[PDB]
């Protein structure tokens, strides 16, 4: 499978999430995603085929994980945006006020701005702290997907949102959306990952 940020993958033939970013740890191929998507050694599949297993994760507290892939996988420095792609250039953290987009298998590519940092989400399982809030919309399925500026700076991975009964927060004004994501840098240094860039 070509590993592109934003595409669907299943965890143990059951939940769905979206790929955040192609990374490497030494000779190992991987991708960052959300911690709540799978437990360590859960099987990721992309299009029926097994692509890898959860190597590590932290959820709740944080919401982060990486999936080590079999070497058959083709890591790519892109994030899906319809039939187009955004090249991943680096991981400079953008500031509040900045415009940012996100990609996932449910709502596709959506943009908005970063509204606040260091938010605590109080999920049913426990608090997850240090999340950044943006107001681009998202839906169930989008977790783990890429948040990225149009200039190609990888920001993070989808954690959670204020979901309405249609499974997403795209039918309410941006002013009311609280879409939260886990910052990429801490995940990257914590697992000793290097982001694939183009």
């Amino acid at each position: 499978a070509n590993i592109v940020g934003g595409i669907e993958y299943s965890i143990n033939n059951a939940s769905l999430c979206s790929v955040g970013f192609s990374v490497t740890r030494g000779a190992t191929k991987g991708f960052v995603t959300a911690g709540h998507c799978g437990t360590v050694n859960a099987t990721a599949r992309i299009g029926g085929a097994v692509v890898g297993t959860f190597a590590a994760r932290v959820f709740p507290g944080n919401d982060r994980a990486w999936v080590s892939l079999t070497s058959a996988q083709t890591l790519l420095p892109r994030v899906a945006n319809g039939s187009s792609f955004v090249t991943v250039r680096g991981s400079t953290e953008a500031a509040v006020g900045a415009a940012v987009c996100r990609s996932g298998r449910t709502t596709g590519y959506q943009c908005g701005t970063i509204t606040a940092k260091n938010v605590t989400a109080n999920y049913a399982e426990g608090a997850v702290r240090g999340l950044t809030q943006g107001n681009a919309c998202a839906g169930r399925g989008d977790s783990g997907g890429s948040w990225i500026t149009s200039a190609g700076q990888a920001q993070g991975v989808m954690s959670g949102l204020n979901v309405q009964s249609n499974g997403n927060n795209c039918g309410i004004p941006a002013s009311q959306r609280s879409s939260l994501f886990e910052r990429l840098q801490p995940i990257l240094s914590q697992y000793g990952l290097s982001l694939v860039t183009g």
Binding site: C17, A34, H36, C37, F59, P60, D63, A121, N122, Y123, A124, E125, V128, R140, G141, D142, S143, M158, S159, G160, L161, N162, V163, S178, L180
Partner: peptide, 4 residues
């Protein structure tokens, strides 16, 4: 907010 709910995780996903």
């Amino acid at each position: 907010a709910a995780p996903f």
